[PDB]
Design a protein around this ligand. Structure first.
Ligand SMILES: Nc1ncnc2c1ncn2[C@@H]1O[C@H](COP(=O)(O)OP(=O)(O)O)[C@@H](O)[C@H]1O
Lengths: 462, 124, 577, 60, 145
């Protein structure tokens, strides 16, 4: 393969550089930038005319000039050389191995931007997963092949909940009839602007629990240049689509802190003066978050799956910033860690009223988890919601003026929050979580529980 | 310990391929002593000026500035010597700013990926 | 060497033409005086030099001379006890030569080229040297200031000058190549000093207060932020961190801040004593001042010069504490260089790479093992002055994703004069887990249980404060009410640090633990004594309670004799009711 | 005395898991160097045809 | 509101504030400076021995403590009845009223520094000495007439 080298770079500012008299670069191609002291940087063509070509630059732009810096074409579509002997490695945000080991010998060259999966050829995500977190396994059920992120605040423990899920998430065949045959999870752990203090947590967690032999890590630390975050989720999802849909794995993708990704493309989309949505983020960001999140799910006819837990760090911990707003319009569920429950020392500080999982109703119920599962979930939301809006009434009229079957609500609420939500690093199975939910519902009088059918309210109450 | 075995396997495999590739660079840089090479350098210059229409000049090592000269008069192109460019010859396009390199070193380091898959498959 | 002339002069930015070939982020002398500016936005054959100093009087046609290097600091011996301005030139020598005003474009060396330093080598000819290996040492003030090979340089030692006393510019170690090594080397500020690997922090940074080392500690390689509105301190706490720490050196960088701060630090520091070595407390601090009226483009680079000098003392194996003051004024400087450059902003004028720059600033912290093999750490405390109180800024949230401990100063709690004004609802700290081996080793065994009890009393008292405001504070039953009175004793005794007192401005871990034990013994025996049934109206005027409320006022050396007597007086007091 | 017996069980117990640890890890280490030597046995056994393959396909 | 850009951006560059108050103005008090939101971030230098009279800092401190306590208790006496309050709270209410009628409301006259300090002690003699915590007892002996 020959190598063309264009020169005549007109303009270099910020992320962007130009090259005029350059016509034979494809749109979306990769370039490598070769400065005067002999150092390759990466780049990607984002606009081509017959005159010029605009390149965005992955590494930092210091040290470039205009009488050197040749631009050489590579990979007219952006590819990743994917292999299966790839499940013990670390990588940085371009795919270059950063553990000292040799580069991998590519079985395939997949295109990094993916292709949209065919909505006939999907399969409805059926099979239950359990996480050992009772709020998740009961009220916001995760099923396999599902997008649901974790909305969290500034300084909540979200990395610990994601590592806890990936430590103990197993699929139960005792309740479904599949047969054991137990395949555990490959983990594709993508990370965008983690500092060191969270990276050391995840690496110590994985090397303890024995997961670095099944996980491929795509680390983009926060001192690496801030545009290769645009490649990193696509790297991780191309690897996940490979390992799931062509080798029958059951892949779990942890996409750390999408707020850093979304700021990484606000930066690029405001080097181009592209007209924004709200609070500066560009008009097309929904399509980018869509092209990341919707590369998940199961396939009809295959055994693979991709299950995504993205993480969000909601800026002023609200659901109205454009990043949680759009992220909940794409995916199917979210779980919101609440700041208020965290200050009570409660771990995992989920609160159920602003969290949900849309694929609960597929995978819970008789024959597949237990027949009373969905109604228990309904009644817990009803009772705890009534307890919270009677706390808002305690907040003016004082504790004394509450009657009865009101104080049992008010005691249901905090007994709930400190016996059901609060748990340490323990793994509670679904029988444990359901019998604790019946224990908590036993406090209410039997005639109050109006969303539970009478046979289930008979054979479990008390 | 299974990680230890796996890392031993992957590093020994990688040292095997790097040994293969160093031998390949050795055979490439031992081509230009063996007289089949000026029969070769014209072919890559040929494909270079194929893909680069309007190619203003050719720049090469003076190993084959005396050689290709009569083999490029009919090319209508100017020839010059700027050595340190072994095993190939590159085509300066229209008034600078665009140039096409073809050379055995660059062909190796840009074909090495698909050749690594196929070579590891033929080797193991 | 690429030389051109000025084309346009738009405010504090100068657009020079004729400069084909000058690299980006170089440092180019603009003007006929020789001001210092910096290339961004190459375009055609044209630079975009932001000048650091003010720019009145430049005509068109004056030369612009590139130097072909990015912004470099000089690192070597002679920096401590030093006030440097933003671009690292020593202000005391500016006052020697210029006058008492900071004029434009004075050229002095950051390290004095005339000073005699004793050299004592540690290598032989033929010894290999690599990046970051120590070569010999220089005694500076109370330090074994050890010089070190620049982090790019490898090879073998050909010849070493023997032990004498020399100058900073003296070529002392010659390699086997023709590479000289003097006692200083220059480093580009926008690049990290490399490390071998980065340890995770397990060791507290004893800030010397009583709320910020007990309730919300911060480890040694840690990052912490102090956001606060005006008139809520935020500078008295930065100075109490400057004085009363366990850092070995302290790089106090003020960028865009009151000038009286810096002259307080220059006047009152050389008559203090660091409680680690003796000697003046000014002998360990390097302070980089860029006062608010000094030019606004240099307070971008002032932060980077500070963090590079702290990394150099990190690589010598110290525990450095960098204190950036008003990173929000740094972000304002990024705004004013961005809108000058005509960009499209996002979220209140700030350029959208704000979190990229601020994140790569705070990332340079941590506890590492240096390339010489000896370990060392640099902690970073950043002051944030958000505009209207209003912690929903871009600067506050962008730093809030990445800093590790967060200290919210409330200005409502500093308008009734409660100092330090650290709120304990809103402020958090993520290093409280990893320090518990250190606490259970070196302060107590039950110290985590003890400060957990104190934080639970504060949460109970603050969640009960609402009904305290709602209905009558005498109209609550008394065992409930005792939580209110012990909450009052906590927040007017344990979190009430004076910082102008001569002995309350530093409280070690033993004395913090002693005051905690007094308050919890009082609480436990008064709770049990009211379970017995006594008068809460009588439980309060006990004279042991003033003995508690001034237990923060006795010295660190006369404390345990005070303490054990007060503990016995607790039990002797609650017998007799 | 039940506490003393628990501590003695714990001490010999530590020794048990540590001996198992060291023997198994050094076992896996020497099997690792044997596997490395196995693929280096394969290495020069076929290396000339691979060099010939790439040295045909990289040449014009 | 202080969060307007002119109050806060002055408050970052300066050395304290002196804040007039709306509510003290409507009671005919002049100059209507209330002392609770105001402070001087300096004034440890410019007080004390020689530069002022000796007892200056402690008197200023004790006035701020007592007036803060009195204004808290007359916030609370608006809520609870005006008799359900103990013995010292009546002296704190009478101190806050005597304070803001005699110390602040000076009108036109040009008070010296000692006239201000002897009005300060004249208002502090409305309190028992055990209620005077910050003033060290030597100044209590010399003054407090
Ligand atoms: N020089 C430039 N650098 C970066 N972005 C640009 C530049 N010029 C235009 N853009 C952005 O890209 C878009 C270009 O659209 P336009 O040029 O009209 O048609 P086309 O889509 O064919 O390029 C504009 O909306 C603008 O936001």
């Amino acid at each position: 393969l020959l190598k063309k080298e264009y020169t005549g770079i007109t303009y270099i500012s910020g992320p962007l550089l130009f090259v005029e008299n350059a016509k034979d670069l494809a749109y979306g191609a990769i370039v490598d930038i070769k400065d005067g002291t002999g150092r390759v940087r990466g780049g990607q063509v984002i606009e081509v005319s017959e005159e010029y070509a605009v390149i965005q630059v992955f590494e930092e732009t210091t040290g470039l000039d205009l009488a050197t810096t040749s631009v050489s074409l590579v990979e007219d579509v952006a590819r990743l050389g994917v292999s299966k002997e790839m499940l013990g490695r670390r990588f940085n945000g371009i795919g270059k191995p950063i553990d000292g080991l040799p580069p991998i010998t590519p079985e395939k060259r997949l295109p990094i931007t993916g292709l949209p999966l065919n909505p006939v050829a999907r399969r409805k995500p059926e099979q239950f997963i359990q996480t050992g977190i009772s709020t998740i396994d009961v009220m916001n059920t995760l099923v396999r092949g599902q997008k649901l992120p974790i909305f969290s605040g500034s300084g909540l423990p979200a990395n610990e909940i994601a590592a806890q899920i990936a430590r103990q998430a197993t699929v139960r065949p005792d309740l479904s009839g599949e047969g054991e045959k137990e395949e555990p999870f490959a983990v594709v752990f993508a990370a965008m602007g983690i500092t060191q203090r969270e990276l050391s947590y995840f690496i110590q967690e994985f090397e303890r629990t024995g997961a670095l032999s099944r996980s491929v890590l795509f680390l983009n630390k926060a001192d690496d240049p801030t545009i290769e975050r645009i490649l990193t989720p696509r790297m991780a999802l191309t690897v996940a689509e490979y390992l799931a849909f062509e080798h029958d794995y059951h892949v779990l993708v942890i996409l750390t802190d999408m707020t850093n990704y979304c700021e990484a493309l606000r930066e690029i989309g405001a080097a181009r003066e592209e007209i924004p949505g709200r609070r500066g983020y560009p008009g097309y960001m929904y399509t980018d978050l869509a092209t990341i999140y919707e590369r998940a799910g199961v396939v009809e006819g295959k055994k693979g799956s991709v299950t995504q837990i993205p993480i969000l760090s909601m800026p002023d911990d609200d659901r109205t910033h454009p990043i949680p707003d759009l992220t909940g319009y794409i995916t199917e569920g979210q779980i919101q860690l609440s700041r208020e429950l965290h200050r009570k020392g409660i771990y995992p500080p989920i609160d159920p009223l602003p969290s949900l999982s849309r694929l609960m109703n597929n995978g819970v119920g008789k024959g597949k988890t237990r027949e009373d599962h969905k109604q228990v979930s309904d009644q817990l939301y009803s009772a705890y919601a009534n307890g919270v809006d009677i706390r808002k009434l305690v907040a003016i009229i004082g504790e004394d003026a509450l009657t009865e079957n009101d104080r049992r609500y008010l005691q249901f609420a905090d007994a709930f929050e400190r016996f059901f939500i609060n748990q340490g690093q323990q793994n509670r199975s679904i029988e444990e979580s359901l019998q604790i939910a019946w224990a908590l519902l036993s406090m209410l009088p039997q005639g109050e529980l109006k969303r539970i059918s009478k046979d289930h309210i008979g054979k479990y109450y008390g | 310990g299974e990680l230890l075995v796996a890392t031993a396997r992957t590093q020994a495999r990688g040292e095997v391929l790097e040994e293969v590739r160093r031998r390949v660079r050795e055979a490439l840089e031992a081509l230009p002593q063996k007289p089949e090479w000026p029969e070769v350098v014209r072919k890559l210059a040929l494909e270079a000026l194929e893909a680069l229409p309007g190619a203003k000049a050719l720049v090469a090592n003076p190993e084959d500035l005396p050689h290709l000269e009569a083999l490029a008069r009919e090319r209508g192109v100017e020839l010059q010597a700027e050595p340190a460019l072994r095993l190939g010859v590159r085509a300066v396009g229209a008034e600078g700013k665009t140039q096409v390199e073809n050379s055995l070193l660059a062909r190796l380091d840009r074909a090495w990926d698909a050749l690594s898959s196929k070579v590891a498959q033929a080797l193991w | 060497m690429i030389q051109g002339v000025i084309q346009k002069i738009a405010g504090p930015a100068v657009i020079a033409k004729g400069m084909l070939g000058a690299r980006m982020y170089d440092i180019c002398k603009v003007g006929e005086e020789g001001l210092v500016g910096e290339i961004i936005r190459l375009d055609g054959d044209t630079a975009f030099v932001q000048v650091y100093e003010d720019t009145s009087g430049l005509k068109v046609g004056e030369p612009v001379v590139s130097t072909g290097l990015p912004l470099a600091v000089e690192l070597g011996p002679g920096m401590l006890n030093g006030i440097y301005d933003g671009i690292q030139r020593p202000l005391e020598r500016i006052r020697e030569k210029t006058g008492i005003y900071i004029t434009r474009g004075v050229v002095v060396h950051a390290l004095d080229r005339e000073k005699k330093w004793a050299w004592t080598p540690m290598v032989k000819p033929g010894d290999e040297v690599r990046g970051g290996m120590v070569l010999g040492t220089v005694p500076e003030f109370g330090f074994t200031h050890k010089i070190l090979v620049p982090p790019d340089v490898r090879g073998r030692v050909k010849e070493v000058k023997p032990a004498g006393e020399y100058t900073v510019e003296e070529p002392v170690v010659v390699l086997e190549d023709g590479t000289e090594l003097k006692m200083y080397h220059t480093w580009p500020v926008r690049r990290a000093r490399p490390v071998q690997r980065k340890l995770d922090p397990n060791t507290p940074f004893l800030t010397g207060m009583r709320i910020l080392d007990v309730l919300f500690p911060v480890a040694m390689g840690g990052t912490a932020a102090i956001p606060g509105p005006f008139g809520s301190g935020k500078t008295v706490t930065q100075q109490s961190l400057a004085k009363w720490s366990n850092a070995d050196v302290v790089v106090y960088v003020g960028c865009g801040e009151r000038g009286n701060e810096m002259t307080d630090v220059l006047v009152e520091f050389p008559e203090l004593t660091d409680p680690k070595t003796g000697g003046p407390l000014m002998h360990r601090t390097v302070l980089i001042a860029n006062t608010s009226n000094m030019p606004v483009a240099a307070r971008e680079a002032s932060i980077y010069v500070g963090v590079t000098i702290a990394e150099y003392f990190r690589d010598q194996g110290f525990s450095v504490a960098l204190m950036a003051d008003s990173t929000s004024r740094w972000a304002e400087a990024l705004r004013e260089i961005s809108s000058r450059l005509e960009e499209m902003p996002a979220e209140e004028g700030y350029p959208p790479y704000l979190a990229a720059r601020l994140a790569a600033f705070y990332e340079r912290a941590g506890k590492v093992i240096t390339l010489g093999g000896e370990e060392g750490a640099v902690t970073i405390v950043g002051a944030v002055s958000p505009p209207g109180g209003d912690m929903s800024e871009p600067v506050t949230q962008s730093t809030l994703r990445i800093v590790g401990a967060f200290w919210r100063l409330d200005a409502s709690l500093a308008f009734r004069r409660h100092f330090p004004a650290i709120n304990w609802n809103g402020s958090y700290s993520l290093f409280t887990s990893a320090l518990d081996p250190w606490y259970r080793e070196n302060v107590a065994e039950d110290y985590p249980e003890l400060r957990d009890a104190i934080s639970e009393l504060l949460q109970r008292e603050a969640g009960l404060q609402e009904i305290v405001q709602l209905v009558g504070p005498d109209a609550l039953q008394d065992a409930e009410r005792l939580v209110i009175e012990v909450g009052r004793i906590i927040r007017e005794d344990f979190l009430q640090q004076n910082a102008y007192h001569e002995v309350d401005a530093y409280c070690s871990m033993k004395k913090a633990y002693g005051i905690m034990k007094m308050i919890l013994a009082f609480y436990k025996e008064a709770e049990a004594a009211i379970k017995r049934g006594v008068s809460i109206d009588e439980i309060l005027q006990l004279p042991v309670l003033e003995r508690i409320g001034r237990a923060r006022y006795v010295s660190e050396e006369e404390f345990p004799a005070y303490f054990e007597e007060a503990m016995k007086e607790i039990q002797g007091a609650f017998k007799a009711l | 005395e039940a506490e003393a017996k628990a501590k003695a069980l714990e001490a010999q117990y530590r020794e048990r898991e540590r001996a198992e640890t060291e023997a198994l890890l050094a076992r896996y280490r020497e099997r690792a160097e044997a596997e490395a030597k196995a693929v280096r046995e394969k290495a020069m056994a076929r290396l000339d045809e691979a060099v010939a393959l790439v040295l045909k396909e990289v040449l014009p």
